[PDB]
Design a protein around this ligand. Sequence first.
Ligand SMILES: *[C@H]1O[C@H](CO)[C@H](O)[C@H](O)[C@H]1F
Ligand SMILES: *[C@H]1O[C@H](CO)[C@H](O)[C@H](O)[C@H]1F
Ligand SMILES: [Mg+2]
Ligand SMILES: [Mg+2]
Ligand SMILES: [Mg+2]
Ligand SMILES: [Mg+2]
Ligand code: NA
Ligand code: NA
Ligand code: NA
Ligand code: NA
Lengths: 203, 204, 1021
Amino acid sequence: ITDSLAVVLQRRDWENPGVTQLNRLAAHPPFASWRNSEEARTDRPSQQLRSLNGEWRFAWFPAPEAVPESWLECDLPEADTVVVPSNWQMHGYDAPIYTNVTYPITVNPPFVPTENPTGCYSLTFNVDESWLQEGQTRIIFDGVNSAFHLWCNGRWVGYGQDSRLPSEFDLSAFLRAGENRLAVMVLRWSDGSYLEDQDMWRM
Amino acid sequence: DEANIETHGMVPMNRLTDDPRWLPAMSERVTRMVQRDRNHPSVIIWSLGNESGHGANHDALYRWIKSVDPSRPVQYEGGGADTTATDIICPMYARVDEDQPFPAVPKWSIKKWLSLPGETRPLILCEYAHAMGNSLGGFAKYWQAFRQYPRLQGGFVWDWVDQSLIKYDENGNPWSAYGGDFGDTPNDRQFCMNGLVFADRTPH
Amino acid sequence: ITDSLAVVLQRRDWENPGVTQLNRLAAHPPFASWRNSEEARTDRPSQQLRSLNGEWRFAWFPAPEAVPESWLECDLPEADTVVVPSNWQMHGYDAPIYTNVTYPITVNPPFVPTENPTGCYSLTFNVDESWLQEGQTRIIFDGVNSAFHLWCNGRWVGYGQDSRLPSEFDLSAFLRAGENRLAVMVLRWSDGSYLEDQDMWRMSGIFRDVSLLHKPTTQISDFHVATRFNDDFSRAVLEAEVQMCGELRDYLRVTVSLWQGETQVASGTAPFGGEIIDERGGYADRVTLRLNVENPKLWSAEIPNLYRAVVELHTADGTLIEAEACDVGFREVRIENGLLLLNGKPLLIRGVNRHEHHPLHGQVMDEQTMVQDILLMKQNNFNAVRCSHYPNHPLWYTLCDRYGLYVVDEANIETHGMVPMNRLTDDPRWLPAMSERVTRMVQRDRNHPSVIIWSLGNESGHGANHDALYRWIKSVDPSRPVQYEGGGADTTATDIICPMYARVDEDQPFPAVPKWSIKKWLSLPGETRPLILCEYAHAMGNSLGGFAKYWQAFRQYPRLQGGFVWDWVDQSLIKYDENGNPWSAYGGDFGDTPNDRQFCMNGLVFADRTPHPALTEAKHQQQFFQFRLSGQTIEVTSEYLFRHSDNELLHWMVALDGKPLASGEVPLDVAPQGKQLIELPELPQPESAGQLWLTVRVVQPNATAWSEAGHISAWQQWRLAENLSVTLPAASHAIPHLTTSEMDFCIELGNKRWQFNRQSGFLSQMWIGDKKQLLTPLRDQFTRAPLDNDIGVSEATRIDPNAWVERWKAAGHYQAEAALLQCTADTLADAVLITTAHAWQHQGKTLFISRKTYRIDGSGQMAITVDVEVASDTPHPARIGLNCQLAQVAERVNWLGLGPQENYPDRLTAACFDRWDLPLSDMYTPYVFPSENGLRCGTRELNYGPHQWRGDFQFNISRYSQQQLMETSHRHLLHAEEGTWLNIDGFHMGIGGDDSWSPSVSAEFQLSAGRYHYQLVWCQK
Ligand SMILES: *[C@H]1O[C@H](CO)[C@H](O)[C@H](O)[C@H]1F
Ligand SMILES: *[C@H]1O[C@H](CO)[C@H](O)[C@H](O)[C@H]1F
Ligand SMILES: [Mg+2]
Ligand SMILES: [Mg+2]
Ligand SMILES: [Mg+2]
Ligand SMILES: [Mg+2]
Ligand code: NA
Ligand code: NA
Ligand code: NA
Ligand code: NA
């Protein structure tokens, strides 16, 4: 219930420079968690590290509000299957903008426009329970533009800003053995946007 | 390595950078970077960001890094390319011999810049020789100067690849698109194409 | 619904350093929103400003969760009516805690404990709708500890952290005409708590003012003032920067006027829009004016010259939108070439640290008190104060501005309990939080002239966050230097070397963060900064020993620019006994755990603002006039930088052993930093025997704003001469008669009789007539009821085997047994002679040996001679003297020696040698935590009752045995003993105070000679 959109979006974290993250872990150099020296030594691949890149389900909305509560629970009918990672403008969802100096949105920090292209990404996956027993399990987004909320198995997890750095969260307490489902709600505009006026395509 | 901060559209440019309220946000942007990348030998300079004027938040951040990672110098062009927040004079587009004396943030000929009273820093252009379209005229002037003045230690050309996107015609023919080609508004058109190479990595 | 607690508290903002506020407005100097220039100009009261202080409804809960949803809606049945502002522990809701270092809660940032005392405050009020129509209405909390949520008319509004700064919110959209209701939920613990580990009582609530402010939609959002001068201060520039909020229109104007009372000194008007600042342009919504001022009058703590500045936001036609104002001081603070200057001159800080504390109100402040403090300080020669360790109540600054005191503004950050101390300060994650704490302060206080230094906080180690912040300020406000002691007192984050408790000449070389002798500190290779101690001379209990050493050094070393004593007032609270009797309480007195006991009492004054004796020592060492005596000439030197001795009278006087022979008066005429010679009239050359002493005092004929007429501001005395007595006692027509029992010896002479017990070897009783005179036999004494300093602990937990007391105890000083080695009696031609020798031992060790002679003559005088030997290997004893309990009890006490206040060997410079007479009561110092006190040194003659003692000693006298004192923890528990207790010391150890958690008594003050000798004469009238 407090995991409810209605509730979560109430705060409008994306319109507050004071909130740039929620429950996001601390930063650090790259980890693999090898369990064998040699492997690490030779840069092999670590099994404690797993990619979630691939097909995912996507759905676009003109606004966060328009997102339907069910989304949390169940995938949409009208959802598409998409490759991650990617930029949604690249898939026809909306337009990429090429402005230099001038902000794409109206200048009224820390406010973002009411119509803010929301992208609901979801993904269902499996987890070895071995992981579920001992240790700690976190998820990592190397890059999400510009802002976003996150749920795991219906449960609200956290929030993050800054499109260029990684975001990490402890999933440890939301995971179930076997089948899990992530629901990431991503926003075009955020207060972070005011700090991202680079002369490039806005995606 | 450069922090993710550009407030270029603000007015004046440092509207936010000079505001405490934004300090935390900014802060995160620097700290985190550092935290993440500091072990790579290729990173040799830290940069606070780009075109965000010059504000106190900058000074504070500059300092922070200095304290945390003294192994690398810090640079930042905003607000004149020679502020208290930069270890290197890193202007963008300063001419070899001509001065461009804008108010508040003039761009001196780089040879002159070095000699200003009290100036002691090295100078490296953060941006030079705009490679847009049929360009790069005058490149050699720079090289020569760089070669003759010790304190002129080079620069970074702007920039590598054109920021063009592919589109298709009815015949499913691909073509290079730029600003406004997506009905995107507002837009700056070709301005996103300043590379030395074409998006496909084919050389100009 | 989303206004629902259930929902709101879901987030648990108070357990997230990332969230320090929600919907809180921006910081700024104080606004009133006057709508009339004159009013603003004269500081009248603005109607757009309304106080919500008063009766409010309160209810307490063990936890936030326990709060009931209805609360939002309706007041509770079980609610109480309470006064705001206040601290709820002060009303019995829960306990106040007195812990120093150790955090009250468990260390697990950013987590607070589950049981967290919640206080629900509510208030219903009315609003003129006029306000409701146009403009903007916000509310302001000057102080709420530690964190809180807020609702208005059922609607959730915002959240805030940092107990020491104001929180503002726009109410504009929640107000209804007429009846409104606020609901504030306040929490004890928050993540903010981790940044608030100050050594003080841990309290909570809405302890500072609550108010409402009505402002135009288009208003003045902020402004700053700055003064620049020529090389000689012959001319200045006032520069004001103003910012506006609202919508911008070309007919807008700004006017800034400067007033000197009735006089308008300067004015300037302009339209918004700044100079180009960068490639994008300037600030359209700001404007900066520059006013020229010729021969401005400077502000100083010596002479707080003020000006009034008015900022009017108006239209081009003349219509005023609103006004704001402030007092302005023309002064320049700068560090140049190792020195801290003010208006070009190098300062000498006579400072003190001060907390916002009231014995009754807890942490709630008021004008009345504030002023009191100020007055006192000023009267005691203080010129500066440090806001240990958070921004103070706003009024304070004004007062200081007006009265004249230099101030150090300090950010609200102490993480003392962390480990290592900089665990958080060195963490980026905490940077934002920290940041807010500094930025906001600055934003708020920067226009006050009294603030001359910014401080980043206290005892939080040294971390990068510090450096960053230091820098920030430097950039934003270059007008003042920044200091910070953490991490060694000399880091990159401080402009001044500001250690705490560094000794004058001794080094304390702790690892990583050694404390060098301050003279040495300056000379370290590459060091160039000035040094000012942020804390020195711990005033806990009977302390301040060694104060003068500091003063002297300060005076001799240029770069030593003073310090701040720690600290002003004891942090004691009042309690009541069953008889509804009030009494001073300290740590643990509320069952508070954990606690640091007396540790919260380190003031120069008692919570009621009653002075400790130490205060005087301070007053004297800090005097602004210095004297030198040469021949018949007195040299006077002024330590004023800016004023002339225009309210000064010098009274002098000569006395012989107390007998005044001549006195005079001379008006002072000295320039700041100048000398004045005073020629003395031929002095009297008494024949009589005794000591000739000269004494001078400085008086303020006329009253001042902080002093009464005839105030004494300085004094000094000198011994001119000595005429030794060569006379002899005339013959007695008789001589005492000795009688020997088996049990003792009896000396008789007239009505007089003396008895010495033969087994004890002591003078056991004596009679005058048929009246016994003693309840206790006269005997040697080598110890004292430990002083705070002797005990020396800073944490209840940690005991120092090196503490004096520890050593004394362990040595058996407190329990050694006397042993008669010998006792003899003999009859001389003119007297009777008694001889004794005792040994004090402990476990086979002989600690001391005492050898005496008593000689009674025909005149009925008893002369005593004492010679003591002390084992080289025993710890130096606290004292060497005698004691006894007299049967009698009298009203007054009269002596010829140093006085009149309590004075100790290492704390007696302020004392004067003269003849004093006081009531017995005054001979006792009611230190809350009791110990040895009331001593007076350099006494030659003492009178009590029919008795008289002569020699050269120190003594104390009261109704309490040392044992009682030593055994009672609170002043309120002592009770007078049967007669009068008298302690006569041939010698007494110093008291120390460089710090109170280590041995701080200088060697020159220890009883280390090994051999001591003293004599006395006892008689009656
Ligand atoms: C330097 O100039 C180029 C112009 O093409 C870009 O705008 C960069 O972002 C700027 F830093
Ligand atoms: C300096 O020392 C005193 C000791 O009584 C207090 O703990 C202050 O807070 C500290 F800064
Ligand atoms: Mg935000
Ligand atoms: Mg740009
Ligand atoms: Mg918080
Ligand atoms: Mg402390
Ligand atoms: Na070169
Ligand atoms: Na470009
Ligand atoms: Na000095
Ligand atoms: Na203390």
